[PDB]
Amino acid sequence: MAASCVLLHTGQKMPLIGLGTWKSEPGQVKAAIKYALTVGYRHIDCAAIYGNELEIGEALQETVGPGKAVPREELFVTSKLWNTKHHPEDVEPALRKTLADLQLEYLDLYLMHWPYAFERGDNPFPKNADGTIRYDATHYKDTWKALEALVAKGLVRALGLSNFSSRQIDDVLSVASVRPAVLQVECHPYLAQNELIAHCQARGLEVTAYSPLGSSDRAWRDPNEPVLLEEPVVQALAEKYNRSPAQILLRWQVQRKVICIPKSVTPSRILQNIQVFDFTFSPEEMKQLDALNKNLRFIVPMLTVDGKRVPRDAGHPLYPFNDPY
Numbered sequence: 001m002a003a004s005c006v007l008l009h010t011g012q013k014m015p016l017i018g019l020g021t022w023k024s025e026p027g028q029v030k031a032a033i034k035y036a037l038t039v040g041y042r043h044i045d046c047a048a049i050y051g052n053e054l055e056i057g058e059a060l061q062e063t064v065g066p067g068k069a070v071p072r073e074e075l076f077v078t079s080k081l082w083n084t085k086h087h088p089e090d091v092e093p094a095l096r097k098t099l100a101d102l103q104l105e106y107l108d109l110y111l112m113h114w115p116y117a118f119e120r121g122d123n124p125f126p127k128n129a130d131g132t133i134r135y136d137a138t139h140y141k142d143t144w145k146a147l148e149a150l151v152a153k154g155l156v157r158a159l160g161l162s163n164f165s166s167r168q169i170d171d172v173l174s175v176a177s178v179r180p181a182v183l184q185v186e187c188h189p190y191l192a193q194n195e196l197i198a199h200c201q202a203r204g205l206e207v208t209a210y211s212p213l214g215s216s217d218r219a220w221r222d223p224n225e226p227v228l229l230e231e232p233v234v235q236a237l238a239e240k241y242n243r244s245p246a247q248i249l250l251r252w253q254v255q256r257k258v259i260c261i262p263k264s265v266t267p268s269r270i271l272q273n274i275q276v277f278d279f280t281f282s283p284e285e286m287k288q289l290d291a292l293n294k295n296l297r298f299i300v301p302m303l304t305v306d307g308k309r310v311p312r313d314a315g316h317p318l319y320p321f322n323d324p325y
């Protein structure tokens with residue numbers, strides 16, 4: 001293991017650096033997984049919705065397990081339950097499909113991808129006549145209880161939440177027999193999540209930062225919005241430390257003890273992204289980076305409806321991002 005860890009409340013050690021796999025396509029992801037594991041990654045972040053678990057599974061079967069290059073117990077694998085699978089009856093089949101594709105016997109962590117549900121079925125984006133999303137009203141508290149049964153079946157070691165707000169977290173905690181262990185949200189110097197991180201610390205949830213590098217090749221970017229990797233302060237620190245802008249972004253987080261899952265398919269970047277535990281920022285440098293916070297969220301679900309590109313879910317009563325945190 002190249003990265004250091006944090007201790008989850010379950011007793012699990014979670015490496016502070018994991019490999020993100022969103023947009024890592026079938027035909028490239030297998031190579032990315034194998035390279036990452038070889039250079040010391042022991043944490044992979046996956047999701048059914050990314051459309052690549054089948055291929056990730058082939059890589060893990062080659063590389064991980066008895067008689068292979070990496071012992072299964074040394075590997076931390078996260079997946080996520082997609083929006084169409086919030087019904088208590090659909091939770092186990094969804095997980096078992098993910099286990100099958102990944103060719104694993106268990107996950108180390110399984111997250112509820114969003115608090116709100118989509119219509120049950122085999123369309124991951126079910127749509128109305130008008131082309132807007134068709135929702136299902138299963139409450140996330142009922143989904144949570146069904147996720148708990150999976151821990152009892154030995155299928156998942158830990159559970160957590162993705163894109164939940166502080167109120168929704170507290171709502172889950174009021175009924176949780178198995179406590180969420182991790183919250184995964186967008187986090188980087190433009191969206192520091194300071195209040196939500198503090199909230200999680202108080203309740204025993206470790207935080208994972210998704211899009212820790214500003215997701216710079218995300219679809220339909222605003223040309224007027226800044227590029228986090230081009231941030232002058234970041235470029236300045238990169239110079240000073242003889243490191244890449246990406247390493248500065250990741251160091252800032254792991255110095256805060258925030259787990260980061262940067263995605264890359266480029267072997268050199270994969271390697272450099274885990275090499276963030278051999279330098280330290282001064283208190284003044286941390287302060288420079290903390291000053292960049294500006295409530296700039298890059299990852300907002302979007303849709304094409306009637307010729308215009310619109311927020312997918314922003315109007316939903318259960319949308320997480322409306323509260324202050």
Ligand SMILES: NC(=O)c1ccc[n+]([C@@H]2O[C@H](COP(=O)([O-])OP(=O)(O)OC[C@H]3O[C@@H](n4cnc5c(N)ncnc54)[C@H](OP(=O)(O)O)[C@@H]3O)[C@@H](O)[C@H]2O)c1
Pocket residue numbers: 019020021022023045046113162163184185209210211212213214215216217218229244246247261262263264265266269270272273299
């Ligand atoms: N829970 C959720 O709703 C959710 C949502 C979004 C993301 N996530 C997770 O978080 C992971 C990471 O977030 P993300 O994929 O949105 O974006 P990201 O990790 O912030 O950035 C990925 C982009 O940065 C590039 N990159 C990687 N390393 C670099 C480096 N060292 N220097 C310069 N560029 C570099 C990648 O290019 P190359 O790959 O071409 O090298 C890719 O274009 C995802 O893969 C996914 O696992 C979860």
Ligand SMILES: COc1ccc(/C=C2\SC(=O)N(CC(=O)O)C2=O)cc1OCC(=O)O
Pocket residue numbers: 022047049050218219220221298299300301302
């Ligand atoms: C593969 O399915 C997905 C499709 C779209 C998204 C969300 C996106 S994609 C994208 O370019 N952006 C940014 C934006 O719309 O400004 C988003 O907010 C997220 C998806 O997966 C959920 C995830 O990233 O974990």
